[PDB]
Write a protein that binds this ligand. Structure first.
Ligand SMILES: CC(=O)N[C@@H]1[C@@H](O)[C@H](O[C@@H]2O[C@H](CO)[C@H](O)[C@H](O)[C@H]2O)[C@@H](CO)O[C@H]1O
Length: 137
């Protein structure tokens, strides 16, 4: 799949919806980004950064009307340059739950409440995208 890749989510997101992304981090990778979009707004921005002040950190945020909000940062960094990964985003009623390589990583409380209007997922960054899909559990 060509990155940046756009995965349309017909009818928006809904609890019990599971998105699975498989890929390989490029060697010398700098960043990865998943953008759950509601029109121009970004409902949930998941952004692993490989070198932020020589620190590997995951930044999560929401962008409303061209403005980024309060960042939520995670130190647990499970991605590795040059290695295959699997990211699963499970949509729950109150949060997006993220697990990487089968290990729960983080939860992101819904700032954008109209879930049915979050109808696109943008995937970009320094990765080789192998697969991107969704299902209902
Ligand atoms: C430490 C700190 O506050 N750093 C922020 C940067 O993280 C921020 O970068 C933007 O962050 C958003 C997510 O919040 C998104 O990843 C953008 O791509 C990225 O540019 C920057 C701009 O808001 O400000 C710094 O101070």
């Amino acid at each position: 799949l060509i990155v940046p890749y756009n995965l349309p989510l017909p009818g928006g997101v809904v609890p019990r919806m599971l998105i699975t992304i498989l890929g390989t981090v490029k060697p010398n990778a700098n960043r990865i980004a998943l953008d759950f979009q509601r029109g121009n707004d970004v409902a949930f921005h998941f952004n692993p950064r490989f070198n932020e002040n020589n620190r590997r950190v995951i930044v999560c945020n929401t962008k409303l009307d061209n403005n980024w909000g309060r960042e939520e940062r995670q130190s647990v960094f499970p991605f590795e340059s040059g290695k295959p990964f699997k990211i699963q985003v499970l949509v729950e009623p109150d949060h997006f739950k993220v697990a990487v390589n089968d290990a729960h990583l983080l939860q992101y409380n819904h700032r954008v409440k109209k879930l049915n209007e979050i109808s696109k997922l943008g995937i970009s960054g320094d990765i080789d995208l192998t697969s991107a899909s969704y299902t209902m559990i």
